[PDB]
Amino acid sequence: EKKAVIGVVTISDRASKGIYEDISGKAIIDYLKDVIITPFEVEYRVIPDERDLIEKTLIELADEKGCSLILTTGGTGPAPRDVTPEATEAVCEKMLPGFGELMRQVSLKQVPTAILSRQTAGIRGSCLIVNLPGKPQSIKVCLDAVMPAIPYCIDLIGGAYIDTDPNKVKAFRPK
Amino acid sequence: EKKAVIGVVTISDRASKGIYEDISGKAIIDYLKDVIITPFEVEYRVIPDERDLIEKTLIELADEKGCSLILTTGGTGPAPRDVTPEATEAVCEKMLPGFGELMRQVSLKQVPTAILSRQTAGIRGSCLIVNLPGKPQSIKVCLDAVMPAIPYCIDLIGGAYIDTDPNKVKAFRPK
Amino acid sequence: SEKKAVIGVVTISDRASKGIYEDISGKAIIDYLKDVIITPFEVEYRVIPDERDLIEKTLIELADEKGCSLILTTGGTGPAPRDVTPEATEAVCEKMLPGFGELMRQVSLKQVPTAILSRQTAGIRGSCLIVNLPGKPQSIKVCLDAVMPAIPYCIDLIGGAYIDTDPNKVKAFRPKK
Cβ contact, residue pair C97, A108, below 8 Å: no
Cβ contact, residue pair C95, A80, below 8 Å: yes
> Torsion over CA of A144, A149, A154 and A155, rounded to 10 degrees?
130
**What are the angstrom distances between the C-alpha of C135 and each of A6, B96, B102?**
47, 18, 22
Q: How far is C53 from chain B (nearest CA, A)?
A: 17
Identify whether the C-beta of residue B117 lies closer than 8 Å to the C-beta of residue B84.
Answer: no
Experimental method: X-ray
Contacts 24+ apart (CB under 8 A), B31-35: B31/B139, B31/B140, B31/B143, B32/B6, B32/B8, B32/B71, B34/B165, B34/B168, B35/B147, B35/B164, B35/B165, B35/B168, B35/B169
The DSSP output letter for A2 is P
Chains that touch C (3 or more CB pairs under 8 A): A, B
Instruction: Give chain C positions within 8 Å (CB) of B156.
Output: 78-80, 117
CA distance C129 to C151: 8
Cβ contact, residue pair B79, A157, below 8 Å: yes
Compare CB distances from B98 to C80, C81, C117 and report the shortest one's residue. Answer: C117
- CA atoms lying within 13 Å on the CB side of residue C119: 24
A167 contacts: CB under 8 Å, gap ≥ 6: none
The resolution, in angstroms to one decimal, equals 1.7
A160 contacts: CB under 8 Å, gap ≥ 6: A2, A3, A4, A5, A40, A68, A154
Phi first, then psi, for residue C130 (nearest 5°) are -115, 125
- CA atoms lying within 13 Å on the CB side of residue C44: 21
Closest to B113 measured CA to CA, from B86, B90, B133, B94: B133
Question: 3-state SS string over C45-57?
Answer: EEEECCCHHHHHH
Element (H, E) at A53: helix A51-59
- Which residues precede a break in chain B, with C-to-N distance above 2.5 Å? none
CA distance C11 to C160: 22
Phi first, then psi, for residue A25 (nearest 5°) are -60, -40
Residue ranges and CATH numbers for the domains of chain B are 1-175 (3.40.980.10)
Selected residue of B69, B94, B146 to mutate for chain C interface (largest C Cβ count, 10 A): B94
B13 contacts: CB under 8 Å, gap ≥ 6: B48, B49, B81
What SS3 class is residue A41?
strand
A95: left (phi over 0), alpha (psi -120 to 50) or beta: beta
Strands A69-73 and A5-11: parallel
A6 at the B interface (CB within 8 A)? Answer: no
The DSSP output letter for A64 is I
CA distance C16 to C45: 13
Count how many residues are written for chain B. 175
Closest to B113 measured CA to CA, from A167, C140, A172: A172
**What are the angstrom distances between the C-alpha of C38 and each of B90, C35, C139, C166, C170?**
47, 8, 23, 6, 10
Hey, which residues does A11 pair with through a beta bridge? A47
Compare CB distances from A78 to C97, C146, C171 and report the shortest one's residue. Answer: C97
Strands C70-74 and C128-133: parallel
C89 contacts: CB under 8 Å, gap ≥ 6: C55, C59, C73, C121, C122, C123, C130, C132
B74 at the A interface (CB within 8 A)? Answer: no
CA distance B160 to B158: 7
Cβ contact, residue pair B104, A97, below 8 Å: yes
Closest to A116 measured CA to CA, from C56, B114, C96, B46: C96
B101 at the A interface (CB within 8 A)? Answer: yes
Q: Return the CA Rg of chain B.
A: 15
Packing angle of the helix pair A136-146, A97-108 (nearest 10 deg)? 130
Hey, which residues does C73 pair with through a beta bridge? C10, C132
A93 at the B interface (CB within 8 A)? Answer: yes
* Residue ranges with strand state E in chain C: 6-12, 42-48, 70-74, 95-96, 122-125, 128-133
Packing angle of the helix pair C85-92, C52-64 (nearest 10 deg)? 40
- Concatenating the DSSP letter of every residue in B36-76 gives B-S--EEEEEEE-S-HHHHHHHHHIIIIIS--SEEEEES--
CA distance C10 to C7: 10
Identify whether the C-beta of residue A162 lies closer than 8 Å to the C-beta of residue A69.
Answer: yes
Question: 3-state SS string over B75-106?
Answer: CCCCCCCCCHHHHHHHHCCEECHHHHHHHHHH
Hey, which residues does B164 pair with through a beta bridge? B36
